[PDB]
Amino acid sequence: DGRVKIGHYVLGDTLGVGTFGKVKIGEHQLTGHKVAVKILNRQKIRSLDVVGKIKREIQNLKLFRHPHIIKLYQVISTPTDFFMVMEYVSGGELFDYICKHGRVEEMEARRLFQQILSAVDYCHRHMVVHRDLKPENVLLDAHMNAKIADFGLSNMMSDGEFLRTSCGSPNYAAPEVISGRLYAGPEVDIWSCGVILYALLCGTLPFDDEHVPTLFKKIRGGVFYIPEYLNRSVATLLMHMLQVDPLKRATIKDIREHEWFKQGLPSYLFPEDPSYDANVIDDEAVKEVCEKFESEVMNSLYQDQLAVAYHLIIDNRRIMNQASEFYLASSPLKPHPERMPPLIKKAKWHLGIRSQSKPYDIMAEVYRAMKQLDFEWKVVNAYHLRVRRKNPVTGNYVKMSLQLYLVDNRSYLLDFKSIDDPRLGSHTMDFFEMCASLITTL
């Protein structure tokens, strides 16, 4: 009677403590339906200035609809706390399963890895990076299905921008994360997944040490032991996933193509697969119908005229995706008739403009060059500027971001990046023309 109740759920034992907040089991007062309630303290969020991160985290978890990602049912707001009512899974952490059995058998390990990678790929396609992938953050249900959960250290990846924030346990963190360097995002999640696959199959970590500076040297070295009980196929997949070089590191497409990963793989886990279009609802396809005819089209699908409209886009999308050579260029058969012979040679392209002088001297030359060309800038960092120039013909402002980078011990680089938010002119021409003025002056 005097129990703590949020909604119609009675709060029980603490399931654990996440990156942000506390998680408690919830049991429905009338039915006994079980949920997991993540309690976020409003003052703790304010004290840490994590208001923006919490906002983006809720937005994504509400949008997310994947069988291998923990569902968020509702968020109950109170004057002191935020109560995130989520899907409950009885099997607990994957970490505890690995410890109980010593090591997971190849068949079950692959099945679980295929489910984890399916969830990771869903996040990446929705421009979200987990950045805290470990078996502790991978939960199991009653039917032994994997579900990724703590999106506290997650972030959204935008066009042209990089991520730096040092997130996750050192044992699962990529060499670039440890080094405190800028990274794209997805390659960091693939490293963590490689460590999970090693831990599933071996029941041990590929890089482990009591002394932290030695552990960091081990990860940066990328040298790990491959046990004799693992076949060469899985070994190559692990070696491609755990590459020190992020450019040489495996992509989700590379893993999907691997002979070991392909075995007994369900045809509904990944997009473009034979059962994905027939069993998985496409958000972008439903949104395209909304502008033509906003209401829910679920009743017609679960044959009505409204349902055919959804499937027409899905069919047309498949035809365009099947003709791979028509929309994208192949990796380097008769040559294309329009292939042009070589001139007469072979000039190489480069990012922005390079300088071997001191970084303070480079920046000083930038401020002078801008002032002569009547530019207006904002100093967000000592090496990061937000420049603006009004176009005289179109009467519109042209915006670009300047960033100074370190190439080597003596070399530096000035990066130019356009900012998009011109009817008479052209946006791309405005960026090129603003860059040209600054390049010629410098």
Partner: protein
């Protein structure tokens, strides 16, 4: 609307009394360390106290209000924004907060700094125009670019007074790598 009353402090027996229950002692259930109660309360100011181990006390982390006689009661304002998540997050964001474009150069450091610029990410060195197409396909076609290389400027070395600039830009779910030849 649900309102949380949590006792972070220690104790064996904790009670809650306020303006909402005519200052009567309500027993709080304990977990491992917390003593909590979730009550449905209307919008407005609410005064409350805590009765721990036979002694009157208050939460120091919550706002303090002293009456005409001298009794200390915690005050909590139940607002309309506190019921909806996105409205509550909007109030929390503006609470943390509590410029223009210029032609003035920034100083080297607040205090003298030898701090180096960030190390160039290797992804930007993957030049789309330096890569070979494969002969079978249309010469206009290019591979799918990394989202991270988008909007970045790429250039050729100035030859015979003409400069060449390129960049990869997005249009909906498609990418265009425009090249511009203009005299310097």
């Amino acid at each position: 609307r649900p309102t949380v009353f949590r006792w972070t402090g220690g104790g064996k027996e904790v009670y809650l009394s306020g303006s909402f229950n005519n200052w009567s002692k309500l027993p709080l259930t304990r977990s491992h360390n917390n003593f909590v109660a979730i009550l449905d309360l209307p919008e407005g100011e609410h005064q409350y106290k805590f009765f721990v181990d036979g002694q009157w006390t208050h939460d120091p982390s919550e706002p303090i209000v002293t009456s005409q006689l001298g009794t200390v009661n915690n005050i909590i304002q139940v607002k309309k924004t506190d019921f909806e998540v996105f409205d509550a997050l909007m109030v929390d964001s503006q609470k943390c907060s509590d410029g223009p474009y210029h032609q003035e150069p920034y100083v080297c450091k607040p205090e003298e700094r030898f701090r180096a610029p960030p190390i160039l990410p290797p992804h930007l060195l993957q030049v789309i125009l330096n890569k070979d197409t494969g002969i079978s396909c249309d010469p206009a076609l290019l591979p799918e670019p990394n989202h991270v290389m988008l909007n970045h400027l790429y250039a050729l070395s100035i030859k015979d007074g003409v400069m060449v600039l390129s960049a990869t830009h997005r249009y909906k779910k498609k990418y265009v790598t425009t090249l511009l030849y203009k005299p310097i």
